[PDB]
Design a protein around this ligand. Structure first.
Ligand SMILES: COc1ccc(N2C[C@H](O)c3cc(S(N)(=O)=O)sc3S2(=O)=O)cc1
Ligand SMILES: [Hg+2]
Ligand SMILES: [Zn+2]
Length: 256
């Protein structure tokens, strides 16, 4: 079944998910010089102060930190969005080396990792219904750059030994997602898709202009995870990213 290996990675995805060849697939290259500065874009409103994390889980493709989305506890509004979008989980895509790992690239430059904060549009009642809609999800994408440690990332990094193999989870309450945001909330936005199977074109992508820094030992920890379940041969979880797709008649708008 799908993964990121030679035999089941991105280039093979189209056979089971034909939408991989669709019209608004993600990720894409953000060419800064032809993105259109749109003056009618409102600022983003990230209200993560009431966020309730529940659990961290290795799912064989990445580790996800899941949040309680039963009430409007951590939401995203504003920007290009019409409506309130609830936070349900965040995850990362990273490389085996520091020069690759992001999914979106800026002027073809790749970062060491990319954080995705997944939100679903509350007018659709639940996540399941939201993924049936063109404006069902908004994902906030943050590039991670190697340098100085991000203190808010360290709690995540310390629990990764308990969830080394596929299927393991550990309770992960009281984690505050605000410690992973950059200073600026300037962004690029375009209509796109999920970047893993099922590749549904349900997403308004909001990619922040400002990267956050993590140390190499923090990102090293990411690389010790396993794609495999325990008792299986070990495959290190590295390079779990999809290459950029053609923009195909889409324009990227810049809030700046
Ligand atoms: C059957 O219903 C479902 C439909 C979709 C999903 N997704 C899991 C995917 O792995 C995936 C990938 C995302 S990314 N890299 O941000 O573009 S977001 C996301 S998901 O959590 O929405 C789960 C259940
Ligand atoms: Hg959709
Ligand atoms: Zn992702």
């Amino acid at each position: 079944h799908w993964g990121y290996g030679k035999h089941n990675g991105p280039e093979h995805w189209h056979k089971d998910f034909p939408i991989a060849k669709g019209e608004r697939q993600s990720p894409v290259d953000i060419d800064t010089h032809t993105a259109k500065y749109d003056p009618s874009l409102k600022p983003l409103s990230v209200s993560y102060d009431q966020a309730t994390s529940l659990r961290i889980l290795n799912n064989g493709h990445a580790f996800n930190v899941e949040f309680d989305d039963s009430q409007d506890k951590a939401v995203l509004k504003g920007g290009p969005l019409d409506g309130t979008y609830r936070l349900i989980q965040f995850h990362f895509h990273w490389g085996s080396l520091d020069g690759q790992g992001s999914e979106h690239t800026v002027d073809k430059k790749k970062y060491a990792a990319e954080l995705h904060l997944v939100h679903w549009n509350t007018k659709y009642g639940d996540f399941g219904k939201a993924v049936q809609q063109p404006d069902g999800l908004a994902v906030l994408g943050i590039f991670l750059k190697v340098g100085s440690a991000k203190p808010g990332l360290q709690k995540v990094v310390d629990v990764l030994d308990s969830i080394k193999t596929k299927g393991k989870s550990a309770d992960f309450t009281n984690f505050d997602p605000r410690g992973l945001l950059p200073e600026s909330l300037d962004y690029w936005t375009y209509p796109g898709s999920l970047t893993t199977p099922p590749l549904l074109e349900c997403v308004t992508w909001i990619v922040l202009k400002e990267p956050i820094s993590v140390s190499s030992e923090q990102v090293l920890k990411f690389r010790k995870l396993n794609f495999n379940g325990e008792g299986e041969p070990e495959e290190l979880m590295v390079d779990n990213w999809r290459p950029a797709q053609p923009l195909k008649n889409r324009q990227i708008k810049a809030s700046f």
